[PDB]
């Protein structure tokens, strides 16, 4: 029975930017066109050089963020050019049946599939690809996972019945990866993901991962590639994990409003230091910026964030507010008259 | 002062399953009588055959669920036979009082005890094995642990004013196996649980495990004991942890309302895709299927759920619905006029 | 612009102790003046003797509890005495800009500084030293965290109208530790914090602590230094954890309110069993004790709690109540004519 609605086809950005929409929409139901095409690839994980057998959605580490509202459909076309070596799919969190859509998108090297899901449930969700069997884990921490967005056809709202809009999205998704080593202690380098499977399986039972990274690599958002903002902008930071958990922590910030298992049909939590998105999961958080500087967004084990990878920069431009926040007085010796035991 | 309740006997079942009881009740309070049989044997926990020195109530991991309402009395003969090695006793997360039970429990080989606990806190709780010291870890880990669920009398509800009621309950527990390796990588054999315990406390300090199970091994719940639901079903999914954190998700479905830490005081969370169970407690989510076909019960460390043992499989009969979901094109060769880049 | 408020100085306690400070105040907003002292100093961390190069706020870990009220200004004069060997700054994950203060108190050895910042997010919340790169966690996982409430102006409330009061607040400060052992297994000493660094920082990499404590040290809370309470008396259990999740539990209590986020704007969660702390931030959890005795407070990976550290024992008196809990029946042999199979 045909699906007689508009269609609208969007194209997609390369995180940590997203694709223009609305946030409230007058607009009735449509149905959303989106393509993907896998790609596997060699790619450079962080400062050091390494290098690692990537496989992607769009080129990019996390997929692209899809956003939708409430109602829409979403027909999805993934493609997988015969340039890539092994089958691929896509398992949407967002939708219902068929494995998340897994079991209707199986696509050889060459092949294109159609799936379309109709986008009943609110939130940001995680989507991953999941061939069967041990290449499920396999795939999704080689990088193949992203997120969508279901936004509320009025928008975000507190859950006390008043509207949140946001100024600024940004989507960062977070990636363990597991890259093996050799006796000296090296990471390893490989012409195939499949010449790299057997070595990469052995770290990845282990369940600790060599490099947790936001967008693909350590450093990818710091530097010249931080994020923008402003004083006075309501932020929404979309985080997202398909394999493992993390502990978001905006450093010099907080959560303002924050879902941290993603669903807009709950009200979120106020005022949150550090949120929690369970692996396979994507969550959000706003905030409204209140001081320029640099602020760090990072997991709060500090370890991953400092040494394994997952330290972004928000770079904020603005007048500084002395009365949240002062320096008294500047670093100075320790008066001689001071005890201190 | 002697407690002059009327006393009602209950048979348990073996996980997944669950014992006959009633979702609302307007029987007064009672004194629900379990009896709880601690057995160590060997077991096998996964498909290549690997066995373990394991420790149970009742012959099962998890340890049965239990069912009772908000005020009844539970009134538990926990019995150790002479053919077990160790003393055992029982901790209830859901009891007030003496370690939960535990100290009031310690059995030898050969003995037995009753304990009686008010049903005075509502939700999914878990029970375990804790006898003291480092024997606490490794009782629990050896397999002994299950939950019980104390229902409001009137039922579940939305935390809105609206009854929730289910057409079908499973009890899922999940078990971090911790089980040494040779020199050469292979799990090794033991012929009674002291043998083991040494080199399995070495396993166990490093907080690795080497399985992750469901119903006590990999593939329990798959195969031909997937579990049965229909289309329009309401379902009661329990889970438990009592050592380890884990991170639920229903493939191809949701979590429609979820008490993800356990407790029916506090309102469900709704539309959920993952959950968080924090290790040592329950939860349980809802789902009414929408869909027929398989699904895949998973924690979402999806390295956990494919390769260390953590999958379960629904089978779910009726009929598809495209509305919700289809494959507009099957896949096919891209056309020869594509980009793709 | 000169703040011209009232001044107030709080001499601060150690952990798991905290300053007298009060519940719900008429008291208009203060400049709450407080003092920190870094101590770089060897540690004894476990029942064995084994040492540790720790580094410290006040001397402790974790570093004392601040108690200000919302709107408050807190003042904190941050000295790093010149028989330290590192710089150090502070974060307060409380406050609004630069880092959390970590970009205005860098202080060399010899130096102080003084910071101000205002108490406008109530909740429990972590502070900790952050001197940037890889010394951050480094830092942190030394020792060198604590934590600040923010009360309402109101105190407590159960997020339906009703004042909730402590009769007795713990600061229970949760730490993991990276010790480095030699080829033999044994754990290694080192002279300085410097000569530990390399050895250590290969341990945190491999992100499994070789201890998990409370107040320090394993055995740290139990024997004399035991938690003290009275049937009858409300409990509020402060639990922080600045680069690791936990997930405490009461054995043979509950959590009757649990703000496991830590945020007081957000209502609490009710009859928890156990709740979760994501790495980076404190929580908090009322309890009213029903039942004398020994109590043992945990972590629930049961691993950590007893093989790593991580127990602690509230001594609580007062009457036992044979209604909430009772022994039907002491140890006894298997009667002879029971089947039990
Ligand atoms: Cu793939
Ligand atoms: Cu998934
Ligand atoms: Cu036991
Ligand atoms: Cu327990
Ligand atoms: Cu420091
Ligand atoms: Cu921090």
């Not at 967005?149 to 960062?172: E, F, K, T």
């Not at 380098?189 to 499949?194: E, F, K, N």
């Not at 450093?251 to 669903?263: L, Q, S």
């Amino acid at each position: 029975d045909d699906l007689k609605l508009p269609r609208q086809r969007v194209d997609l950005v390369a995180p940590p930017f997203v694709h223009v929409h609305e946030q409230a929409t007058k607009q009735g139901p449509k149905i959303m066109e989106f393509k993907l095409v896998v790609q596997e690839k060699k790619m450079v994980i962080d400062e050091k050089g390494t290098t690692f057998q990537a496989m992607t959605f769009n080129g990019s580490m996390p997929g692209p963020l899809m956003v939708v509202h409430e109602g829409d459909y979403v027909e999805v076309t993934l493609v997988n050019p015969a340039t890539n070596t092994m089958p691929h799919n896509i398992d949407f969190h967002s939708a219902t049946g068929a494995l998340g859509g897994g079991a209707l998108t199986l696509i050889n090297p060459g092949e294109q599939v159609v799936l379309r899901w109709k986008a009943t449930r609110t939130g940001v969700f995680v989507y991953h690809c999941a061939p069967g069997g041990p290449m499920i884990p396999w795939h999704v921490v080689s990088g193949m996972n992203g997120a969508v967005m279901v936004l509320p056809r009025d928008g975000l709202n507190d859950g006390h019945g008043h509207s949140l809009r946001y100024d600024r999205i940004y989507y960062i998704g977070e990636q363990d990866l597991y890259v093996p080593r050799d006796e000296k202690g090296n990471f390893k380098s490989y012409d195939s993901p499949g010449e790299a499977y057997s070595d990469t399986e052995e770290v990845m039972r282990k369940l600790t991962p060599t490099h947790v990274v936001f967008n693909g690599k350590a450093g990818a958002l710091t530097g010249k590639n931080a994020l923008n903002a402003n004083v006075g902008e309501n932020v929404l930071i979309v985080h997202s994990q398909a394999n493992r958990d993390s502990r978001p922590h905006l450093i010099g910030g907080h959560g303002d409003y924050v879902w941290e298992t993603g669903k807009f049909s709950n009200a979120p939590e106020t005022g949150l230091e550090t949120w929690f998105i369970r692996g396979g999961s994507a969550g959000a958080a706003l905030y409204k910026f209140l001081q320029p500087g640099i602020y760090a967004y990072v997991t709060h084990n500090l370890i991953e964030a400092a040494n394994l990878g997952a330290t972004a920069h928000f770079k904020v431009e603005g007048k500084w507010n002395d009365d949240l926040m002062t320096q008294v007085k500047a670093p100075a010796d320790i008066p001689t008259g001071s005890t201190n035991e």
